[PDB]
Coordinates of C-alpha atoms and ligand atoms in Angstrom, one line a residue:
Chain A
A16 CA 70.6 22.9 229.5
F17 CA 71.3 19.2 229.4
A18 CA 72.4 17.0 232.3
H19 CA 73.3 13.4 233.1
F20 CA 70.6 12.0 235.3
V21 CA 71.3 8.8 237.3
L22 CA 68.0 7.2 238.3
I23 CA 68.0 5.1 241.4
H24 CA 65.1 2.7 242.1
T25 CA 63.9 1.7 245.6
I26 CA 64.2 -1.6 247.4
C27 CA 62.6 -4.7 245.8
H28 CA 62.6 -2.8 242.5
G29 CA 65.0 -2.2 239.6
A30 CA 65.8 0.1 236.7
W31 CA 62.6 -1.0 235.1
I32 CA 60.5 1.4 237.3
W33 CA 62.0 4.2 235.2
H34 CA 61.0 2.8 231.9
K35 CA 58.7 5.7 231.1
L36 CA 60.8 8.5 232.5
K37 CA 64.1 7.6 230.9
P38 CA 63.0 7.9 227.3
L39 CA 61.2 11.2 228.1
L40 CA 64.2 12.7 229.6
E41 CA 66.3 11.6 226.6
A42 CA 63.7 13.3 224.3
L43 CA 64.6 16.5 226.1
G44 CA 68.2 15.9 225.2
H45 CA 69.5 14.6 228.5
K46 CA 71.8 11.6 229.2
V47 CA 70.2 9.0 231.4
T48 CA 71.6 6.1 233.4
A49 CA 69.1 3.8 235.2
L50 CA 71.0 1.4 237.4
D51 CA 70.0 -2.0 238.9
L52 CA 71.4 -1.9 242.5
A53 CA 72.7 -5.1 244.1
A54 CA 70.4 -8.1 244.0
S55 CA 67.8 -5.9 242.1
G56 CA 66.3 -6.0 238.7
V57 CA 68.5 -8.2 236.6
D58 CA 71.5 -7.9 238.8
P59 CA 72.9 -11.5 239.3
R60 CA 73.3 -11.4 243.1
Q61 CA 70.6 -12.6 245.5
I62 CA 69.7 -10.5 248.5
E63 CA 71.2 -13.0 251.0
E64 CA 74.6 -12.1 249.6
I65 CA 74.2 -8.4 250.6
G66 CA 74.9 -7.4 254.2
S67 CA 74.3 -3.6 254.3
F68 CA 72.7 -0.7 252.5
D69 CA 76.3 0.3 251.5
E70 CA 76.9 -3.0 249.8
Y71 CA 73.4 -2.8 248.2
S72 CA 74.6 0.6 246.8
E73 CA 77.6 -0.9 245.0
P74 CA 76.4 -0.4 241.5
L75 CA 75.8 3.3 242.1
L76 CA 79.2 3.7 243.8
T77 CA 81.0 1.8 241.0
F78 CA 79.2 4.0 238.4
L79 CA 80.2 7.2 240.0
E80 CA 83.8 6.0 240.4
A81 CA 83.9 5.5 236.6
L82 CA 83.0 9.1 235.9
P83 CA 86.0 10.9 234.4
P84 CA 87.2 14.0 236.4
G85 CA 85.0 17.0 236.0
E86 CA 81.8 15.1 235.0
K87 CA 78.9 15.7 237.4
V88 CA 75.5 14.0 237.5
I89 CA 72.1 14.7 239.0
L90 CA 71.0 11.8 241.2
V91 CA 67.3 11.0 241.3
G92 CA 66.2 8.5 244.0
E93 CA 62.7 7.2 244.6
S94 CA 61.4 6.0 247.9
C95 CA 64.3 4.3 249.7
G96 CA 66.7 5.5 247.1
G97 CA 67.4 8.6 249.2
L98 CA 69.6 6.4 251.4
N99 CA 71.6 5.3 248.4
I100 CA 72.0 9.0 247.6
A101 CA 73.4 9.8 251.0
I102 CA 75.8 6.9 250.9
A103 CA 77.0 7.9 247.4
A104 CA 77.3 11.6 248.4
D105 CA 79.8 10.7 251.2
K106 CA 82.1 9.1 248.7
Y107 CA 81.6 11.2 245.5
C108 CA 80.2 14.6 246.6
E109 CA 82.3 16.4 244.0
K110 CA 80.6 14.4 241.2
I111 CA 77.1 15.3 242.3
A112 CA 75.5 18.5 240.9
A113 CA 72.4 17.9 242.9
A114 CA 70.2 15.2 244.3
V115 CA 66.5 14.9 243.6
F116 CA 64.3 13.0 246.1
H117 CA 61.2 11.4 244.5
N118 CA 58.7 10.5 247.3
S119 CA 61.9 9.5 249.0
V120 CA 63.4 9.1 252.4
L121 CA 65.5 12.1 253.2
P122 CA 68.3 11.1 255.6
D123 CA 70.1 13.8 257.6
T124 CA 73.4 14.3 259.4
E125 CA 72.3 15.1 263.0
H126 CA 70.7 11.6 263.6
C127 CA 71.6 8.0 263.0
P128 CA 71.3 6.8 259.4
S129 CA 68.2 4.7 260.2
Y130 CA 66.4 7.8 261.7
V131 CA 63.9 8.5 258.9
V132 CA 63.3 4.7 258.3
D133 CA 62.4 4.3 262.0
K134 CA 60.0 7.2 261.6
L135 CA 58.5 5.7 258.4
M136 CA 57.8 2.4 260.3
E137 CA 55.9 4.4 262.9
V138 CA 53.7 6.2 260.4
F139 CA 53.1 3.2 258.2
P140 CA 53.3 0.1 260.4
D141 CA 51.0 -2.3 258.5
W142 CA 52.6 -3.6 255.2
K143 CA 49.6 -5.8 254.6
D144 CA 50.4 -9.0 252.7
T145 CA 54.2 -8.3 252.6
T146 CA 56.2 -11.4 253.8
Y147 CA 59.4 -11.5 255.8
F148 CA 62.3 -13.8 256.3
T149 CA 65.7 -13.6 258.0
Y150 CA 69.2 -14.4 256.8
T151 CA 72.7 -14.0 258.2
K152 CA 75.5 -12.1 256.6
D153 CA 78.8 -11.0 258.2
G154 CA 77.5 -12.1 261.7
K155 CA 74.3 -10.0 261.5
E156 CA 70.7 -11.1 261.3
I157 CA 69.1 -9.2 258.4
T158 CA 65.4 -9.0 257.9
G159 CA 64.4 -9.6 254.2
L160 CA 61.0 -8.9 252.7
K161 CA 59.0 -9.5 249.6
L162 CA 56.4 -6.7 249.0
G163 CA 52.9 -8.1 249.0
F164 CA 50.8 -7.9 245.9
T165 CA 47.9 -6.2 247.7
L166 CA 50.3 -3.6 249.2
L167 CA 51.7 -3.0 245.7
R168 CA 48.2 -2.6 244.2
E169 CA 46.7 -0.4 246.9
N170 CA 49.6 1.6 248.4
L171 CA 52.4 1.8 245.9
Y172 CA 50.8 1.6 242.4
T173 CA 47.5 3.0 243.6
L174 CA 46.7 4.8 240.3
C175 CA 49.0 3.0 237.9
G176 CA 47.6 1.1 234.9
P177 CA 47.1 -2.7 235.1
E178 CA 50.0 -3.2 232.8
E179 CA 52.3 -1.3 235.1
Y180 CA 51.1 -3.1 238.2
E181 CA 51.6 -6.3 236.3
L182 CA 55.3 -5.4 235.7
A183 CA 55.6 -4.9 239.5
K184 CA 54.1 -8.3 240.3
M185 CA 56.4 -9.9 237.7
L186 CA 59.6 -8.1 238.6
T187 CA 59.7 -7.1 242.2
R188 CA 62.2 -9.2 244.1
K189 CA 63.1 -10.0 247.7
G190 CA 65.0 -7.2 249.3
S191 CA 65.8 -5.5 252.6
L192 CA 65.8 -2.2 254.4
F193 CA 68.9 -3.3 256.4
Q194 CA 67.3 -1.2 259.2
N195 CA 69.4 -2.7 262.1
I196 CA 72.6 -2.2 260.0
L197 CA 71.7 1.4 259.3
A198 CA 71.1 2.0 263.0
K199 CA 74.8 1.1 263.7
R200 CA 76.3 2.8 260.6
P201 CA 78.4 5.9 261.0
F202 CA 76.4 9.1 260.5
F203 CA 76.2 10.7 257.1
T204 CA 78.7 13.5 257.0
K205 CA 78.1 17.3 256.8
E206 CA 81.0 17.8 254.4
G207 CA 79.8 15.2 251.9
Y208 CA 76.1 14.4 251.9
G209 CA 75.4 17.5 253.9
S210 CA 76.9 19.8 251.2
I211 CA 75.0 18.6 248.2
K212 CA 71.9 20.5 246.8
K213 CA 68.8 18.6 247.7
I214 CA 65.5 18.9 245.8
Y215 CA 62.4 17.3 247.4
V216 CA 59.6 16.1 245.1
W217 CA 56.4 14.6 246.5
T218 CA 52.6 14.3 246.2
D219 CA 50.2 14.4 249.1
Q220 CA 48.3 11.6 247.4
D221 CA 51.1 9.1 248.2
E222 CA 49.4 6.1 249.9
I223 CA 52.5 4.7 251.6
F224 CA 54.8 7.7 252.3
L225 CA 51.9 9.6 253.8
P226 CA 51.8 13.5 254.1
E227 CA 52.5 13.3 257.8
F228 CA 55.8 11.5 257.0
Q229 CA 56.9 13.6 254.0
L230 CA 56.0 16.9 255.7
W231 CA 57.9 15.6 258.8
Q232 CA 61.0 15.0 256.7
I233 CA 60.8 18.4 255.1
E234 CA 60.7 20.1 258.5
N235 CA 63.4 17.8 259.9
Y236 CA 66.0 18.5 257.2
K237 CA 65.2 21.6 255.1
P238 CA 65.5 20.9 251.3
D239 CA 67.1 23.5 249.1
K240 CA 63.9 23.3 247.0
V241 CA 60.6 21.6 247.3
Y242 CA 58.3 20.6 244.4
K243 CA 54.8 19.3 245.2
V244 CA 53.1 17.4 242.3
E245 CA 49.3 17.4 242.3
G246 CA 47.6 14.1 242.0
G247 CA 49.3 10.9 241.0
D248 CA 50.5 8.2 243.5
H249 CA 53.7 6.9 245.1
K250 CA 55.1 6.1 241.7
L251 CA 55.1 9.5 240.1
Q252 CA 57.5 8.4 237.5
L253 CA 54.7 6.3 236.1
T254 CA 51.6 8.4 237.0
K255 CA 53.0 11.9 236.5
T256 CA 55.9 11.1 234.2
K257 CA 55.6 14.4 232.3
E258 CA 55.5 16.5 235.5
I259 CA 58.6 14.7 236.8
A260 CA 60.4 15.4 233.6
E261 CA 59.5 19.1 233.7
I262 CA 60.7 19.3 237.2
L263 CA 64.0 17.6 236.4
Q264 CA 64.5 19.9 233.4
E265 CA 64.2 22.9 235.8
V266 CA 66.7 21.3 238.2
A267 CA 69.1 20.8 235.2
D268 CA 68.8 24.4 234.4
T269 CA 69.4 25.4 238.0
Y270 CA 72.2 23.2 239.4
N271 CA 75.4 22.1 237.6
Chain B
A15 CA 34.7 -20.6 228.4
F16 CA 37.7 -20.0 230.6
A17 CA 41.1 -21.6 230.3
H18 CA 44.4 -21.6 232.1
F19 CA 47.0 -20.0 229.7
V20 CA 50.7 -20.6 230.3
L21 CA 52.6 -17.8 228.5
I22 CA 56.1 -18.7 227.4
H23 CA 58.6 -15.9 226.5
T24 CA 61.4 -16.2 223.9
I25 CA 65.2 -16.3 224.5
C26 CA 66.8 -13.3 226.1
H27 CA 63.4 -12.3 227.4
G28 CA 61.2 -13.0 230.4
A29 CA 57.6 -13.1 231.7
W30 CA 57.7 -9.3 231.5
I31 CA 57.0 -9.4 227.8
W32 CA 53.5 -10.5 228.6
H33 CA 52.8 -7.6 231.0
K34 CA 50.0 -6.2 228.8
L35 CA 48.4 -9.5 227.7
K36 CA 48.2 -11.2 231.1
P37 CA 45.9 -8.7 232.7
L38 CA 43.7 -8.5 229.6
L39 CA 43.3 -12.3 229.6
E40 CA 42.4 -12.2 233.3
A41 CA 39.8 -9.5 232.5
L42 CA 38.2 -12.1 230.3
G43 CA 38.0 -14.5 233.3
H44 CA 41.0 -16.7 232.5
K45 CA 43.8 -18.0 234.7
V46 CA 47.2 -16.9 233.5
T47 CA 50.7 -18.1 234.4
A48 CA 53.6 -16.2 232.9
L49 CA 56.8 -18.0 233.6
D50 CA 60.5 -17.0 233.7
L51 CA 62.4 -19.8 232.0
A52 CA 65.9 -20.7 233.2
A53 CA 68.4 -17.7 233.4
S54 CA 65.6 -15.5 232.1
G55 CA 63.7 -12.5 233.6
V56 CA 64.4 -12.6 237.3
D57 CA 65.3 -16.3 237.4
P58 CA 68.5 -16.6 239.6
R59 CA 70.5 -18.7 237.2
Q60 CA 73.0 -17.3 234.6
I61 CA 73.0 -18.7 231.1
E62 CA 76.4 -20.2 231.5
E63 CA 74.8 -22.7 233.9
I64 CA 72.4 -23.9 231.2
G65 CA 73.5 -26.6 228.8
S66 CA 70.5 -27.3 226.5
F67 CA 67.1 -26.0 225.4
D68 CA 65.7 -28.8 227.6
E69 CA 67.4 -27.4 230.7
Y70 CA 66.4 -23.9 229.7
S71 CA 62.8 -25.2 229.7
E72 CA 63.0 -26.5 233.3
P73 CA 60.6 -23.9 234.8
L74 CA 57.9 -24.9 232.3
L75 CA 58.4 -28.6 232.9
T76 CA 58.3 -28.1 236.7
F77 CA 55.1 -26.1 236.4
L78 CA 53.4 -28.7 234.3
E79 CA 54.5 -31.4 236.7
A80 CA 52.8 -29.5 239.5
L81 CA 49.4 -29.5 237.8
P82 CA 47.0 -31.9 239.5
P83 CA 45.6 -34.8 237.4
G84 CA 42.9 -33.7 235.0
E85 CA 44.0 -30.1 234.8
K86 CA 44.9 -29.0 231.3
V87 CA 46.4 -25.7 230.1
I88 CA 46.8 -23.9 226.8
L89 CA 50.5 -23.1 226.1
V90 CA 51.3 -19.8 224.3
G91 CA 54.8 -19.4 223.1
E92 CA 56.4 -16.4 221.3
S93 CA 59.3 -16.6 218.9
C94 CA 61.6 -19.3 220.1
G95 CA 59.0 -20.4 222.7
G96 CA 57.7 -23.0 220.2
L97 CA 60.7 -25.1 221.0
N98 CA 59.9 -25.0 224.8
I99 CA 56.4 -26.1 223.8
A100 CA 57.6 -29.1 221.8
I101 CA 59.9 -30.2 224.7
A102 CA 57.0 -29.8 227.2
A103 CA 54.6 -31.7 224.9
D104 CA 56.8 -34.8 224.8
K105 CA 56.7 -35.0 228.6
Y106 CA 53.2 -33.7 229.5
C107 CA 51.0 -34.1 226.4
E108 CA 48.0 -35.1 228.5
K109 CA 48.1 -31.8 230.3
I110 CA 48.0 -29.7 227.1
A111 CA 44.7 -28.7 225.7
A112 CA 46.4 -26.9 222.8
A113 CA 49.5 -25.0 221.9
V114 CA 49.4 -21.5 220.4
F115 CA 52.4 -20.3 218.4
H116 CA 52.9 -16.5 218.5
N117 CA 55.2 -15.4 215.6
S118 CA 56.9 -18.6 216.8
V119 CA 59.2 -21.3 215.6
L120 CA 57.1 -24.4 214.7
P121 CA 59.2 -27.6 215.2
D122 CA 58.1 -30.8 213.6
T123 CA 58.6 -34.5 214.0
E124 CA 60.1 -35.5 210.7
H125 CA 63.3 -33.4 211.0
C126 CA 65.9 -32.8 213.6
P127 CA 64.9 -30.4 216.5
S128 CA 67.2 -27.6 215.1
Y129 CA 65.5 -27.8 211.6
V130 CA 63.4 -24.6 211.8
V131 CA 66.1 -22.8 213.6
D132 CA 68.6 -23.6 210.9
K133 CA 66.1 -22.3 208.4
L134 CA 65.5 -19.1 210.3
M135 CA 69.3 -18.4 210.3
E136 CA 69.1 -18.8 206.5
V137 CA 66.3 -16.3 206.0
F138 CA 67.6 -13.8 208.7
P139 CA 71.4 -14.1 208.7
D140 CA 72.3 -10.5 209.9
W141 CA 71.4 -9.9 213.6
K142 CA 73.0 -6.4 213.3
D143 CA 74.5 -5.2 216.6
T144 CA 73.9 -8.5 218.5
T145 CA 77.0 -9.7 220.3
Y146 CA 78.1 -13.3 220.8
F147 CA 80.3 -15.3 223.2
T148 CA 81.0 -18.9 224.0
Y149 CA 80.9 -21.0 227.1
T150 CA 81.3 -24.6 227.9
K151 CA 78.8 -26.8 229.7
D152 CA 78.7 -30.6 229.9
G153 CA 81.6 -30.8 227.4
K154 CA 79.9 -28.8 224.7
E155 CA 80.7 -25.4 223.4
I156 CA 77.6 -23.2 223.5
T157 CA 77.1 -20.0 221.6
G158 CA 75.6 -17.3 223.8
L159 CA 74.2 -14.0 222.6
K160 CA 73.0 -10.6 223.7
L161 CA 70.4 -9.0 221.4
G162 CA 71.6 -5.8 220.0
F163 CA 69.7 -2.6 220.9
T164 CA 69.4 -1.6 217.2
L165 CA 68.1 -5.1 216.3
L166 CA 65.6 -4.8 219.2
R167 CA 64.5 -1.4 218.0
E168 CA 64.2 -2.0 214.3
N169 CA 63.3 -5.7 214.0
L170 CA 61.7 -7.0 217.2
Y171 CA 59.9 -3.9 218.7
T172 CA 59.5 -2.1 215.4
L173 CA 56.2 -0.5 216.2
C174 CA 56.2 -0.7 220.0
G175 CA 56.1 2.5 222.1
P176 CA 59.4 4.0 223.5
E177 CA 58.4 2.8 227.0
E178 CA 58.1 -0.8 225.8
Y179 CA 61.4 -0.6 223.9
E180 CA 63.0 0.8 227.0
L181 CA 61.8 -2.3 229.0
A182 CA 63.5 -4.5 226.4
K183 CA 66.8 -2.6 226.7
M184 CA 66.7 -2.7 230.5
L185 CA 65.5 -6.3 230.9
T186 CA 66.8 -8.5 228.0
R187 CA 69.6 -10.7 229.2
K188 CA 72.3 -13.0 227.6
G189 CA 70.8 -16.2 226.3
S190 CA 71.3 -18.9 223.7
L191 CA 69.5 -20.8 220.9
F192 CA 71.5 -24.0 221.9
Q193 CA 71.5 -24.6 218.1
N194 CA 74.2 -27.2 218.1
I195 CA 72.7 -29.0 221.0
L196 CA 69.3 -29.1 219.4
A197 CA 70.9 -30.5 216.3
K198 CA 72.0 -33.6 218.2
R199 CA 68.8 -33.9 220.3
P200 CA 66.4 -36.8 219.8
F201 CA 63.6 -35.9 217.5
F202 CA 60.3 -34.6 218.9
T203 CA 57.8 -37.5 219.0
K204 CA 54.6 -38.0 217.1
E205 CA 52.8 -39.5 220.1
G206 CA 53.6 -36.5 222.3
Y207 CA 54.3 -33.2 220.6
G208 CA 52.8 -34.5 217.3
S209 CA 49.5 -35.2 218.9
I210 CA 48.7 -31.8 220.4
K211 CA 46.5 -29.2 218.7
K212 CA 48.6 -26.4 217.2
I213 CA 47.3 -22.9 216.5
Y214 CA 49.6 -20.7 214.5
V215 CA 49.3 -16.9 214.9
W216 CA 51.4 -14.5 212.9
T217 CA 51.6 -11.1 211.1
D218 CA 53.2 -10.5 207.7
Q219 CA 54.6 -7.3 209.1
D220 CA 57.0 -9.2 211.4
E221 CA 60.5 -7.8 210.7
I222 CA 62.6 -10.7 212.0
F223 CA 60.4 -13.8 211.4
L224 CA 59.8 -12.7 207.8
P225 CA 56.8 -13.9 205.7
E226 CA 59.1 -16.3 203.8
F227 CA 60.0 -18.0 207.0
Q228 CA 56.6 -18.1 208.6
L229 CA 54.8 -19.3 205.4
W230 CA 57.6 -21.9 205.0
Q231 CA 56.8 -23.2 208.5
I232 CA 53.1 -23.4 207.9
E233 CA 53.7 -25.5 204.7
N234 CA 56.3 -27.6 206.4
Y235 CA 54.1 -28.7 209.3
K236 CA 50.4 -27.9 208.8
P237 CA 48.8 -26.2 211.9
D238 CA 45.3 -27.2 213.0
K239 CA 44.4 -23.6 212.7
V240 CA 46.1 -20.4 211.4
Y241 CA 45.3 -16.9 212.5
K242 CA 46.8 -13.9 210.6
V243 CA 46.9 -10.7 212.5
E244 CA 46.9 -7.5 210.4
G245 CA 49.5 -4.9 211.2
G246 CA 51.6 -4.9 214.3
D247 CA 55.1 -6.3 214.6
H248 CA 57.0 -9.2 216.0
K249 CA 55.8 -8.4 219.5
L250 CA 52.0 -8.8 218.8
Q251 CA 51.4 -9.2 222.6
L252 CA 52.5 -5.5 222.8
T253 CA 51.3 -4.0 219.5
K254 CA 48.1 -6.0 219.0
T255 CA 47.3 -7.1 222.6
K256 CA 43.5 -7.0 222.1
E257 CA 43.7 -9.0 218.9
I258 CA 45.8 -11.7 220.6
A259 CA 43.4 -11.9 223.5
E260 CA 40.4 -12.3 221.1
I261 CA 42.2 -15.1 219.3
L262 CA 43.1 -16.8 222.6
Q263 CA 39.5 -16.5 223.7
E264 CA 38.4 -18.4 220.6
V265 CA 41.0 -21.0 221.2
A266 CA 39.7 -21.5 224.7
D267 CA 36.2 -21.9 223.3
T268 CA 37.5 -24.5 220.8
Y269 CA 40.0 -26.7 222.6
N270 CA 39.8 -28.2 226.1
Ligands
MNN309 N1 57.8 1.5 246.4 C1 58.5 1.2 247.3 C2 59.3 0.7 248.4 O1 60.4 1.6 248.7 C3 58.5 0.5 249.7 C4 57.7 -0.7 249.9 C5 57.0 -0.8 251.0 C6 56.9 0.1 252.0 C7 57.7 1.3 251.8 C8 58.5 1.5 250.7
MNN310 N1 62.1 -11.6 220.0 C1 62.9 -12.4 220.0 C2 63.9 -13.5 219.9 O1 63.3 -14.8 219.9 C3 64.8 -13.3 218.7 C4 65.9 -12.5 218.7 C5 66.7 -12.3 217.6 C6 66.5 -13.1 216.4 C7 65.4 -14.0 216.4 C8 64.6 -14.1 217.5

């Protein structure tokens, strides 16, 4: 079967991270939309204009709003993209056939929205050469960050080719986790986000979202299905593109 | 010998086009700077804020200005990048060891700055699915454009892989040739631009900068050296990356 996959990049990244996976999925006959979230990729906004993870998710929400009645999509979010998925699911649950988490945070409905992010910071406290700054938006002090090149090389793109790592150095932009804002955000709902089918994909060779963290997330909020990809790194859509496409094809044949 | 190469992308593109060449040059021991020109790549400005090819060249001029006395670089410009080279050479000729044109326009000093662009439009009049728009800046009506996906696929990235073509579809932005502005711009000078060493690199398999055009440019303004790369396409830095690196190494060993 064919599906319409909506690929969602992580913070400081853009649609470009899916440049290998998108054409492969299309070669299987699927429709693919790879969005640039607010102040990401070639989006015209700067991060200082964004005051929350919800505002950051605008392009995704706007895209879902534009889907004609009856049309459903399969969301695929990498790393922090899981938060964009939860936000989107609480507004357009009827338009989501399923959500696929790709070495991604997996928010729940029993704890605050920042819950899994707070845990991640516990498991991976040292972001190496990553730099930080602060800006104010809507009366709140937000912590912005720019991923360090060494962190990118060693922990995020560990096994990626030099040409892929180069794209990261050239294209990654300042962003934010909006952690303190998430902490005060209303909880994700059981009727919306809680109701969607969730497929969790990961590799135990991820050098930033370590096994302890990912296995902790799986136990905390049981996915409907779990796929473990052998080898690769945090950016499975670059290092295990074929494997990810095969998994997504099965998801398309399972949920509609 | 080692050199400091400054890679200059063409209109509607960004530093990302050099994502394969940059690490290869560094593997040879060179220093490489791949800039995003105004309103290009991840530069924060939008094209409507830019009123001339000179303003568009700001990042390059600012970079050259920051070079300490005595430090020289080898400029490498692709496609329309040759115009940025000419503009830069008339301001920082002493900081340029040589300029390498990569399937690039080759401005001269005997004719108006728009001369070779006007000729290009004669040789390649149909830009297929490319779209156009107009905006006003500093009292002048500027024609903006967004490269069509079919033009990108068939004429610019003819032999590039699907993952490279995907990057182009995701990252190319609105831009402009500022043709009418170039037509009224003071001529490039003989003392500045005219004095720098010029190396012309091209392939007769280029599907947009056709042989008739490139051979016409070579006869119009004789380069100090001409390198013809066999095969490949308009984006030699993607399809013949190794060959381009070998040529640049020879240039580094020849001009300083
Ligand atoms: N890749 C990616 C980003 O989501 C990221 C960057 C740094 C730490 C955790 C996550
Ligand atoms: N590649 C590239 C651009 O410079 C370009 C795009 C369309 C026509 C001519 C040149």
